[PDB]
Symmetry: C3
């Protein structure tokens, strides 16, 4: 029922802050999310990272869900502020934190599960923000990250051969420094509050992450990958955009300009060794922090091994007439979830911003492969069903998976896209960041008062979908 | 209360197909049972090995029942078609299959349990059947098996000291190729179906299994045992038969003839290095494939270290007036569960064919030891209760376990038979092969809808029956 | 909220006989408690060590409670009778017993938990009692113990870096050989039984453990610690006594005399290399077996690393006018739980003897450090609630744990006491020895008919107490 390779590594994915809790235990220090969640009035729906799912204490209860679900790999992330218990370079290390992750990795290997490890998933140590402004201080933050990354390669790299440096850098840059909807919540276009400057600060945070990645890849490529033999990558998200008015030249152009303002921003330095896309250099200043010949030096001393790709939904884009403000980051675009002819991007989950678009996903894989184009692992793909533990039946979610795998099969076998693997978001119901515990994305239902976890129908079926796509000269004998 | 040695290994048994499920995942391919179960009209009572107990995904839950029950050891089977994912010799190995078993072995050793691995338990690769006749082709299959065995000695044999090559070769032969009731379902004397020839095929498959065993013990003796230090053995079954008319010449003779067509067939080559019991070379042709001088060369260039014995019940055998057909495999006999003086063999379980005969179990052990006579491990023994999860109270099973441990004790200290261990069938409730899920043999009730396991009374009491049979200079305080 | 160090190793404790069960299994020979529990009429309120918690079979279920509770360390006890299946020195060594604890140690490690091992916890092999009186025989018993300690060092010493020789030597001596309330139940003053002499026996049984400890620590210091790098200690209990009538010189003296008959007895040889506290040598005879020069040879040829302290309650001692009998072991004292001015020591748990007295706990800590004064680990501390599974709400126990941790903070940062760790009695509800299963001391309620464990609130909360007292430069962000 539509052929995925054979190798094809699939599993489940979970960010650190969204499930671990144990915020002050283990000698961990605060993240910028530990401050954002406790603001008065709350910017996080009155939601907290304390407790969460209590994974820190119940990790082996969850890992046995990973063998029950038949998962092959498990993507998770490290809490920077739990390892270097906040700062970097010269700051002391938290041995208890290193030891906590070292026994998770051991826990996993014992079970036959492939650890995929993400170094940074938005949970920047607070101290570094106060000390020099966090991702706003490009020179400093990338040096502090480089040591952190390297520590992790040292302490976990003999096991763990599958690395991801930074998760969705565009959200950390834009939601964190332009709109302020994510930690640290800085902006000129909100309420608000104390500080921000959405005209210059997102483009700093981007370059800082871009260089942070480059540094760690250079470290890994030169000093580790030979002896340790592993992959390293970055994972970018980005909706596919096709034109609003299909019959209009200016919007076939406006839909691609958006996808260069989202993916091209990062994928040009990190994969093509070119600097910023020109559509993007021409709108923003000056305001766009130049890549110096020293930057391409760190970039050209290391390979990024794969394109990690977070996908959930697509959209229609269409132009502007007017001359855009400084405070525009999308690249002169009005985004819609409907086109000219009233028809939607298609079938919804709700939320509302996420809707199931299985053949714009396929289109997405074909564009993102060739420009750029390294192998694509799908590092996040998931969904919330529309609508208690009536949640055990999630037929919407099952059909979301199936149709989105069908266009991975299609992309591979009809468009010659190399896709190597797929992590489903998420293993547990999380804290959906500043959305709170509202949204339930996981294939396991977490009962936030009992901290009890019971499987949804999707968890027990997903192994059977993968099993029925790999074969294949046995669909006989 | 009735001394079993001190050493005396005991624990539970399970068979690969009967519990694992995950029939298509982990790159495993079809065994011949996968085809037999899916016949239309079903020859397996509408039953499936798809799922079963889902032990592929719940194995570690099951193993904590092993320590909950005080089990010292655990016999289980590999799925040939999961390891060499269909065929042998020149065929690719399934690494996901080999590592799945790697982590079982590992999980057991961690719990202090002693893995006892059966290599073959009726789940011959399907491709092998299609490619040359499966067990019907003696020259090929034994070579395909030798490589298979050798892969296992390499991959699991530094752990794993205790090996059983083939489980109940008599059933595979006769029920698989003479009566057609077990997979692959070929016979002349059934409906039916397409193929079979009960005149000639069970004797081929017999020798093919005998030689497959010899081959593997050859490999193990010459190439692994010296370094790995361990046992290889075969586990044969066979009811004990005594005359139907005690008072009378031709039954003292008829019963033992039936016990040669059943144990001696296999035991003569594998233990005595003699060929086929002559009472058998004399009834079958010609139809009985001769052990070539090249076969006694494989047989006596390696030693089988123990007699693995399955036992469930006993019977009264007795003769033919008339000259027996070509389609007679029991050895010119018709068998009863009754002597003529009316009395039953003794106390039934139902089923209906299996009744608890502890007296004749003892006579059996003494017969089977000295002719042939190596140490006996009882590698399967168990029953189903007469009669929901009312099943938790299983007094019948307990008294069954008790009275047969009694006769083991009796056989050791009075008859001087060496009996080194006892595996109870079964740990879980299974697919009882072509009988389906109906007959519950386990000491754990499995709930086939939830896949829930809860122990039965017998599970928690058996550990105590052994502890009280092994002391012994402290029964003093 | 009141600073405990940073290191500060905290966890839960349990004794061997109290939770293990499986009294005949694993070839384990009887302890002295095995006989005392089965006496007619019962001296243990009709209670039994068989089954108990059945932790022998359910150890992994409880260790999972360990990480759920966020424990750092776990103090447990070996069963001498189970390792050397009864006796010492020349007796065989039960392998099935050594491998059992090797897999607890293995399992604890695998979870990140630090094993703390108590060699002896009141469960002396019965064979030794009958062979030469056990503890009454100083010469033989200290020799059989040195072999035992040694073998443990050998078989578990490369894992396991923290050893406790004997748990509460005072109780084994006085309740065992003076009043008879504990096994083996000898005394001149009781119900009854056939033998005893409280005049002389408790002081023999004291010396015999002192030298057993001395022996073990001799071995460990000289042969193991340099390579194995670890700690060895003894854990001593004893109430804190302050004067009954404040205003009175006669028994600011008698309180301290009672603490020397209770702690100084053991602490003087074991930590100061003095012999018996003067006041004690001068009341007892004759009857107090002198420390030969050869004993102070063992003693100062190896050092005890730390002071294990068992604390539960406190008390008002004070005087005797009268000349003391030959059967007074307390030190010429009448002990009350209230002073002259009516007021109680403070707040009851019940039981009735155990009251929550945090104020004097601090004074205790201050006294025991400086004479003697090595770092102190509270190797036991806990209580039962005043009062079914309404026990899950244990707000008295939480208030007990909190106040007594406050004293530890206070003692450290103001009285200059080194306290390095705290173990809470107990992880589970136990067999509280001769009291039976009545008193529920655990932070996990154990249903003795289901052997089901469910956490009380204290368990889930304790980990947050410690998190909150360790920090400490981020108490800010």
């Amino acid at each position: 029922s539509l052929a995925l390779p054979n190798d094809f590594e699939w599993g489940f994915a979970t960010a650190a802050y969204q499930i671990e809790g144990a915020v002050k235990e283990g000698g961990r220090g605060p993240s910028i999310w530990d401050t954002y969640c406790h603001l008065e009035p709350s910017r996080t729906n009155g939601a907290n990272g304390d407790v969460a799912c209590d994974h820190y204490h119940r990790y082996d209860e969850d890992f046995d869900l990973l063998t029950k679900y038949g998962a092959k790999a498990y993507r998770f992330s490290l809490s920077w502020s739990r390892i270097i218990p906040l700062g970097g370079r010269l700051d002391p290390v938290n041995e208890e934190g290193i030891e906590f992750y070292s026994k998770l990795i051991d826990a996993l290997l014992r079970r036959g599960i492939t650890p995929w490890v993400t170094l940074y998933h938005w949970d920047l140590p607070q101290a570094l923000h106060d000390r020099y402004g966090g991702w706003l201080n490009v020179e400093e933050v990338q040096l502090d990250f480089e040591r952190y990354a390297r520590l992790c390669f040292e302490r976990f790299g003999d096991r763990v051969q599958n690395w991801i440096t930074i998760n969705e850098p565009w959200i950390q840059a834009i939601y964190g420094y332009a709109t302020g909807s994510n930690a640290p919540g800085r902006s000129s276009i909100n309420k608000h509050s104390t500080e921000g400057d959405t005209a210059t600060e997102p483009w700093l945070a981007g370059k800082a992450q871009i260089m942070s990645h480059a540094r760690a890849v250079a470290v890994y490529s030169r000093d580790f990958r030979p002896s340790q033999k592993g992959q390293i990558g970055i994972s970018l998200n980005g909706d596919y955009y096709e034109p609003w008015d299909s019959n209009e030249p200016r919007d076939k152009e406006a839909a691609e300009r958006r996808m260069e303002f989202h993916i091209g921003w990062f994928a040009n330095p990190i994969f093509l060794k070119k600097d910023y896309p020109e559509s993007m250099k021409k709108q923003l200043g000056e305001r766009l922090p130049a890549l110096t010949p020293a930057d391409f030096a760190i970039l050209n001393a290391g390979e990024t091994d794969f394109y990690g790709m977070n996908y959930y939904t697509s959209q229609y884009a269409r132009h502007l007439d007017g001359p855009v403000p400084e405070t525009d980051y999308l690249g002169a675009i009005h985004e819609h979830q409907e086109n000219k002819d009233g028809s939607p991007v298609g079938e919804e989950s709700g939320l509302a911003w996420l809707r199931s678009c299985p053949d714009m996903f396929r289109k997405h894989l074909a564009r993102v492969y060739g420009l750029y184009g390294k192998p694509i692992y799908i590092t996040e793909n998931g969904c919330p069903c529309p609508g208690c533990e009536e949640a055990v039946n999630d037929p919407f979610r099952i059909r979301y998976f199936d149709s989105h795998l069908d266009s991975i099969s299609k992309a591979i076998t009809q468009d010659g896209v190399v896709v190597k693997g797929y992590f489903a978001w998420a293993l547990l119901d999380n804290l959906e960041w500043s959305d709170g515990y509202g949204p339930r994305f996981g294939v396991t239902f977490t009962d936030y008062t009992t901290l009890k976890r019971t499987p949804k129908k999707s968890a027990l079926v997903l192994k059977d979908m993968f099993a029925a796509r790999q074969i294949p000269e046995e669909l006989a004998h």
